[PDB]
DNA sequence: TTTGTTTCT
DNA sequence: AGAAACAAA
């Protein structure tokens, strides 16, 4: 139940979530690759824009983030909207709902233009402010999956370019994508937002870090590279979530 | 029907 | 609120 899950996640800790983020999640590997082939500010802007169109995909998330990273490496991006207008219709893994996705990018372009290196630093030190700022730029509910996911992916990109780590705020809830929703239904009849926020508060692990533990493992990522103690805790969690 | 849902009233 | 938004099925 919830108490057992919270105990295991608490033993994994932010330290274990950070390990999974930086060593196991293919999405972080894709971002690391792209960060070597484009300037840091454009990199962060692209990661936010990509997150806001990362829904109802035509491939798995790990496939899609690698397609994004390989596409943009070495490119000279003059307009994020125009870049996506060319990229999406020719993509393999993001072919659905393109007009709607492009309109979202158009809506956020002004906000993205504020993301200088120092503004990125400020938002990484205050991700709750970033959360609300993205939602207000889009005119949407900040509880939505793509907005909360964009904060998570911002934190991946920012830690790469700033060479520093700040934990996600406890108040930002888990991204309710299909993997998380399906898992939650196997575990409980409680709504996922409340279920995972309670586990986050009990364990001390913010929901976006819980997402980093759960989401790669739900896709079948191996835990074998974790050191023995963390590996044991991840094996215990896999018995609950797989 | 939908591989990390949102827009549109 | 929940159907339409596009692709695939």
Author numbering: -2 to 239
Verbatim from the authors:
To clarify the mode of recognition of GO in double-stranded DNA prior to the cleavage of its N-glycosidic bond by AGOG, we solved the 3D structure of a mutated K142Q-Pab-AGOG, a catalytically defective mutant which has kept its substrate recognition ability, complexed with a GO-containing 9-mer DNA duplex at 1.25 Å resolution (Pab-AGOG/dsDNA-GO:C). The space in the DNA double-helix vacated by the flipped GO is partially filled by Q53 and R93 as seen in the crystal structures of the trapped Pab-AGOG-dsDNA-C. First, the O8 atom of the GO-containing DNA is no longer contacted by W62 and second, the ribose moiety is flipped and makes an H-bond with D174. Similarly to OGG1 and OGG2, Pab-AGOG does not interact with the 8-oxo-carbonyl of GO but recognizes the N7-H of GO by a strictly conserved glutamine residue (Q24).
8-Oxoguanine (GO) is a major purine oxidation product in DNA. The major way to remove GO is the base excision repair pathway, usually initiated by a GO-DNA glycosylase. While no enzymes with an A/G specific-DNA glycosylase or a dGOTPase activity have been discovered in these species, a GO-DNA glycosylase called AGOG (for Archaeal GO-DNA Glycosylase) has been initially identified in the hyperthermophilic archaeon Pyrobaculum aerophilum.
